[PDB]
Symmetry: D2
Subunit: 442 residues, 4 copies
């Protein structure tokens, strides 16, 4: 049940007048480099629709980059936010604490993998979350080196840039970068030089390399996205993540899962690591956690997090009470409406339609992902060379028909589906039809 | 002015009370041990100058959440704005689907920041993110590496902002290695100058010569400084220091970044602390007071600098959140409607009055600050040696009597007044009387 | 013509009494970690022999890690050192200059590849040379990032550690390391996941990765050893180096060849890059340059090196006059006795005997050029490394009076680095002892 | 007794024809930037004379930057070199060891301060020596941070550049620099803002700053030149070095004395630390050690040096046998001819003549140093402002008269006397007369 009509509806040309008016204002005051993928301006976002200031209704297949999984306007979240704001907007937990912070931490304790003793701290952005996971790994182990992987993306602060693989646009001319970061090869099945390589073997490759080029006893943390997001929704071969987890335990290395994009029901489980039952030492979270309000978290082993001295982790806004109210509601919606189930159902629908399309075409290199985090990697016809041209084209074509869809990938050639998990089957099918049509058209 | 909850100090028996204790018990099972709070009671409502706890106790708020809730923790305008905006959409990610709130906030910041030259703005979530982004811009725009920060500086808890921060405990210990090419230079700190007669101009020459000999002016991307150093101890530089650095920075092509995260938005009696001396920074970093408690931060700077950054080079997921933007517009509106600059100047007069009366009745080393950002540096009796022990004592004493007051300083010996600017004279005086009684008592 | 008898001769058990005496003195005063691969102490080294203080004569198949290519006692070098020392040991070129420095510089200008304008600066160690190449790349280009490769070795200073791939023993617990260094995959034919990969394709793999993870216009320098030494005498597939060179030129990136181990006739050409006619923008040199005296150098494009401001490059000892005399003599000997030719002849002999051994399995790969050759040892019937056999063989060779070195990322490569003045007779004797040792284990 | 006539003799204009011929050759093949302070080319250097290729004889007041303390042509060194080279030029100690290495190490053990267990490793340059001291400190303590001082100079590798204070010409455009290096204030009496500050107080200032900005238990090493060379022959106030030493011991920090310039009799004692009886944990050496041949060393506590794993420290050329023969001879000459005594005698003569000059003038700011490591800091007439102009002038004037003298200093305004210790009284006086005349002339 929704608030605004859940149907795709484009009334004439866009951007419309009111959108154009805003663009004009924008170019006088916002930095030129801050671009938007979409030229229309939101007035309402709800269920699977973005409606613009000129009354056009677009299908939302990005959920704000995997943020509004509960929908951009979940009545529970809205209510929670409205009520909390009326009491106090901020007191800074480090100064005067409040129940919202604790309550959220209780939930994250419960929902994260593993049954061992865990603790949590809250911050605002995903970047902050990763920054804090690495601080904890470094302090708790007494070691320096952090290993990240090819195709990794972890943020836009200096260290998270360091941890991020792709240079354009995230890194160029923003260094020098935080030291003692090392990059290791990823399990990326579709582009392995030896297509027969298994996950275990891909892990052994990374491990040998870490051991020869750093030494296991020198590494503070291994940080990896269980499904790499911006890198192109790369899902590692079965057996890779457990092999890294087991080795990390053996060498005393903190294993950090970055579940900022993949966390909170997005993949059909509470966390992407749950597909393989990997139990990380620390997990970084943001995006979906608070239904669009700015909140992020790390939850990890009590012995690691409790090692940090008093006042060593924190920030001003972190664990904001309005954001916390949002999160508690958001999580509540995830449970009440079985969004894990909704995500699994989306996978079935969408992989269905996408595989039908593969069977007609050839420009479709690889279809992959889990739950509501799915992707199609587009290639040059008859080879494996990347096709970023087609990818830009298809996004634009979708936008023209009233479907907002995101792209990604190291080679710029991956279309990603990140619908809100509360999307209706009707809308999702409509979106997929538009997408399918667009690919065939170019 | 008019408030929602009774604006009187009122402590009903022992605290923490039962409901606060119940929350502390829940907390210790789920929140990291290191995340400590200065205050053992839990907020239910925060409004005007009162923090009221879950057990009905009403404390005087002399910290405004570390200079965040300048408009008050429950300004009706902010609340209304938040409530309305949340019902439309919580988040779409400005980099994907843009929205008026972002543009409007940017319009305001353009207008209110110093200088009449072309300026642009980008929005993020935390102060740390802001500083991170100011430095990215300086580095990209100038093509240089080095960034100079000062003794007693504080800029944040990400790896780079830790690098920029001077004090190691608790902000840095065991969290490195730190981002490279950061250099530290001496501050104008009148009360502790080895030559008490040194002028601001001379203090600037000292820094400048040192920068030139140890880096070289043409190698420095940015000089970053807090016009009044916050966590360092509300250190106000001698008159003539800031303009000398500004002038030299212009001469050498160095971006001059004013970190106005704590001092910005009326806190000091002007819109920005740099306005006291008419310094016009090349970039200014903002957060805290900007959005009346909601999580928002910003950089506003020369258009030619900010527009230099390539498309998609600056950003983030949550940044410039629409609910936070609504809050900011309302917060700024309240600052104008109720002349909080004026209120801040009036607070300066009242508080510096009472504090100087106390000095006249010796443990009071130095009284300093501007507006609603004031401090008393406490020393050992009859000398200049720091007195952290008395400082902790006084803060505890004040808490006991129902006044929440913050401390800071490189040497742990500074009591800081950061009341909300909407505080009543009656409450402020009560608070200052309690503070003055506490100092005399220990 | 040699000075000491060029025959292998072990008189009983070693270390002998005089060597033992020195070991005892050593353990009181030299840091415990500073270990030597050989337990006997030199008194004379000449041609292909190391003779110890107890009169034992070992075959020298390491030349001091590719340093004494002209021999550890070339009469020309000796004479030149002796004469130059009697005039002055040092004045510091940056203060009072001297002909020796200029002369050496003239030679390096001539002997290095390319006909473009080149300039040179002199230092002491290979690490210093690499450090200074990178300084020049960084200043000249105005960029930060430097790319090195898997299996690289470039030195023991903080930055050259940073550039070096292998952590044990060169890096462990010595960081944090100098920033903006990126590591890229090497062309290592024997261990490519796709055995059919060509040099051109290996280059494209590296180039795409550099471009995606740094950006070509952000890279100050690409630094590579034409034949990777400590990494295991890895020779890249044909077409790899020229591809990197061409791309570097396209993107304005300084291409640094590290010819510290491979330079000066060691591979059969003046420089290892000459095999493929690659012309580097800067080349780093040490080791063989001065017949054992401490000297190192960078020689590169005049426009790059002249970009550096006055007094930006230097050091105290650098371009020491005694070392310079030694270098002029050493280079002279390389020409007069055609050591390039001697090196090529050594390749023929040694690859011959090594391939015979492969016939009759533990021999994974035989590779190298000139007097820089290697055999990579593997577990019987697979490609798994065999460091155990490698240590064993080295020890077995030592026992029989042959000093031979090991190397490799996986600790499983026997390397031949004989002095280029070695006699066929001695070399064959050494190779027979080596072959015997491999068969024995 | 000497080999070439020990008298100043300039025969007409220079550079002469043969020198000019070499300059012409040079400019085609040596990098432009590699400049020499002297335009004539050496043929022989012996005792206190540099004789050029055109037969001119200059007084040598630099000893090759404090290298040829025994003279540039000590017969013992020459003989030793000649004999050693005939046996073998190099075998690489890590491969095939040799007596020369061990013997040198035996000497350095004996001559360095302290009676505790010590060990030594040998390298080639001073930079390499400092690099290795820091490796050891880091590996042995398991900590990262290294503190160096204002006016410090330690070398031209990336890390030793990091450690070095002055940017022109040593650092400009050569970064980014090795991380975790922190800079602390030096005891520099002549330019202290409080002229009455004691060495103990200067130490406390550094220590409090290290403690507040890094934390003692985070610092691997404190590295300092007992007399700062390139920084301007700055001699710290009495009590500074022992204070740092005592504190380092308390906090488990390796105290590294960089005696590369000041070591081996240069200051009138075997090492400059011997003036105050400071016993360093490691000491770095080069220059004088081997009478002009390239050799350098670290000698320090056995427990520190032996902590390094097998093969962790080394290099190809390091501890070269010809250089070792030179060293054993050089050290032997230092003892046989009591160069400590000669240095002390030089101090008396030179400080005498320099103080006479001070009494006539005013442009002489400060006279300082010990032994044969002495300096005069030149200032603007009647003030303390630096006088680099006069300093360059005086060096050129001295050169014109046939006296080669060096300059240095953070501010470019210090004349330094680094004569070889085997210089005759007659020659030294002649040189000082020329210098005194030059200062009076400009
Ligand atoms: C996997 C993963 N980790 C961290 C982040 C960073 O989170 P925040 O932007 O700081 O909240 C992300 C973000 N991904 C979306 C890309 C946004 C952008 O700015 O381009 C992530 O996926
Ligand atoms: C001057 C100044 N700059 C940056 C910050 C960082 O802002 P955020 O806390 O990341 O939003 C601050 C903040 N100061 C409050 C100290 C925070 C703490 O963790 O103790 C600042 O003052
Ligand atoms: C290729 C290459 N580059 C630099 C070096 C360093 O030379 P120096 O030892 O600094 O003079 C080297 C050195 N190779 C020998 C390494 C042995 C060791 O363990 O030090 C090199 O090969
Ligand atoms: C005090 C001190 N420590 C180290 C060095 C470096 O020695 P090397 O030059 O690398 O052997 C020095 C060197 N000082 C001479 C400066 C000459 C120059 O490079 O400009 C030193 O004084």
């Amino acid at each position: 049940s929704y608030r605004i009509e859940q149907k795709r509806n484009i009334n004439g040309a866009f951007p419309g007048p009111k959108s154009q008016a805003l663009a004009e204002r924008r170019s006088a005051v916002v930095a030129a480099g801050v671009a938007s993928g979409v030229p229309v301006y939101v007035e309402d976002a709800d269920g699977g629709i973005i409606r613009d200031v000129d009354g056009n209704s677009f299908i939302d297949l990005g959920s704000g980059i995997a943020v509004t999984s509960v929908g951009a306007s979940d009545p529970a979240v809205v209510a929670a936010v409205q009520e909390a704001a009326a009491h106090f907007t901020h007191t800074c937990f480090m100064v005067t604490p409040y129940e919202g912070y604790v309550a959220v931490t209780e939930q994250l304790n419960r929902l994260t993998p593993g049954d061992h003793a865990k603790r949590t701290v809250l911050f605002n952005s995903g970047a902050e979350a990763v920054e804090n996971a690495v601080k904890v790994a470094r302090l708790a182990t007494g070691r320096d080196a952090v290993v990240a992987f090819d195709h990794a993306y972890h943020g836009r602060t200096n260290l998270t840039m360091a941890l991020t693989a792709k240079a354009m646009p995230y890194k160029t001319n923003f260094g020098p970068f935080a030291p003692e970061v090392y990059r290791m090869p990823m399990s990326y099945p579709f582009r392995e030089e030896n297509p027969e390589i298994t996950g275990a073997e891909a892990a052994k490759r990374a491990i040998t390399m870490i051991e020869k080029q750093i030494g296991g006893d020198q590494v503070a943390a291994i940080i990896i996205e269980p499904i790499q997001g911006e890198g192109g929704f790369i899902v590692p071969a079965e057996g890779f993540l457990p092999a890294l987890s087991e080795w990390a335990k053996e060498k005393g290395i903190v294993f950090i899962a970055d579940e900022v994009q993949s966390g909170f029901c997005r993949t059909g489980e509470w966390f992407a690591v749950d597909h393989e039952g990997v139990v990380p030492d620390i997990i970084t979270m943001a995006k979906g956690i608070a239904g669009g309000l700015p909140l992020s978290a790390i939850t990890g082993r009590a012995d690691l997090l409790d090692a940090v001295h008093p006042g060593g982790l924190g920030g001003t806004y972190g664990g904001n009470p309005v954001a916390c109210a949002a999160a508690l509601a958001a999580i509540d919606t995830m449970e009440q409406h079985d969004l894990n189930g909704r995500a699994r159902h989306i996978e079935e629908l969408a992989l269905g339609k996408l595989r039908e399309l593969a069977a007609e075409l050839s420009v479709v290199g690889d279809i992959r992902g889990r739950g509501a985090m799915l992707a199609i990697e587009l290639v040059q016809p008859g080879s494996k060379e990347p096709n970023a041209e087609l990818t830009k084209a298809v996004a634009a074509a979708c936008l023209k028909e009233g479907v907002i869809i995101l792209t990604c990938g190291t080679y710029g050639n991956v279309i990603r589906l990140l619908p809100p998990l509360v999307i209706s089957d009707e809308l999702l099918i409509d979106g997929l039809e538009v997408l399918a049509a667009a690919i065939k058209a170019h």
